[PDB]
């Protein structure tokens, strides 16, 4: 059944559409169901004009961000204590289990390493993120991490800022 | 005769162009750190604490809006914008 519809000013119509499209809507039900039909077309005219403006401002603010260095030399690292966030990040510090080093500084975080951290009692993970790079006009390979599409570490000269802007504005 | 009284995309755009706790913590932190620490540790530590907290909440608010609609965007792309 099509359920209940809503009038333009928020409130719900005190009459249900108890029939489905196979049974055939009554004349009263068809008129009520036209309320949501009008909303869909009108909301389309604002979903595009707003997301398009949002995308342009998103790309504009980071258009100049390009991978220009292999390593800025930073020592800062965001502390992490979910899995999909940690994959592809570069460790900012060594990780130890007892007296054994299980993960080294400046090493890409695979999912096997992450599972090993979760399997044992590892509380703090220090990673290099865009927040830790020693620049706001460019980013380095290690602070960005693995390429979003090429699997390996990101390559020099990649316009990651425009890709970042397009990735957010696209589903708008 | 009688009167009764009874009980997305705009959200993400508002955050980008600028949480109730975030603005209440920034107000609280501003008036205290400078009074405790003087020469730049008053300003350096205060700015560091405010910016670190802002980045965490700015990414969380944007990610929460997109996750509510099933949109899957990596944290890297948002951290590029927030930076």
């Amino acid at each position: 059944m099509r359920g209940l519809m809503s009038d333009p000013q928020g409130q719900m119509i005190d009459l249900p559409i108890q029939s489905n499209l196979r049974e055939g809507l009554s004349l009263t039900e068809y008129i009520i169901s036209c309320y949501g039909a009008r909303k869909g077309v009108v909301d389309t005219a604002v979903r595009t004009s707003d997301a398009g403006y949002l995308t342009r401002r998103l790309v504009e603010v980071v258009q100049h961000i390009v991978v220009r260095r292999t390593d800025c030399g930073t020592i800062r690292g965001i502390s992490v204590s979910f899995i999909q966030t940690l994959i592809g990040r570069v460790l900012a510090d060594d990780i130890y289990i007892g007296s054994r080093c299980v993960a080294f500084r400046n090493q890409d975080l695979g999912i096997g390493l992450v599972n090993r951290f979760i399997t044992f009692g590892t509380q703090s993970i220090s990673i290099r993120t865009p927040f830790t790079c020693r620049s706001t006009s460019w980013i380095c390979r290690l602070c960005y991490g693995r390429s979003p599409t090429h699997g390996d570490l990101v390559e020099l000269g990649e316009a990651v800022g425009i890709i970042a802007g397009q990735s957010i504005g696209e589903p708008g | 005769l009688v009167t009764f009284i009874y009980e997305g995309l705009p959200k993400v755009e508002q955050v980008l162009e600028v949480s109730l706790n975030l603005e209440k913590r920034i107000k609280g932190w501003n008036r205290c750190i400078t009074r405790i620490l003087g020469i730049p540790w008053g300003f350096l530590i205060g700015a560091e604490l405010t910016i670190v907290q802002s980045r965490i909440s700015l990414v969380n608010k944007i990610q929460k809006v997109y996750r509510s609609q099933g949109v899957q965007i990596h944290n890297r792309h948002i951290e590029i914008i927030v930076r």
Binding site: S124 | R25, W29, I33, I36, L49, V52
Partner: peptide
């Protein structure tokens, strides 16, 4: 959330490695 107490906040950034002596 970093606690609103300035010294608790300082201890937090010490623990989260945001800032140290």
């Amino acid at each position: 959330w970093f606690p609103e107490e300035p010294f608790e906040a300082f201890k937090e950034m010490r623990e989260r490695k945001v800032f140290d002596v």
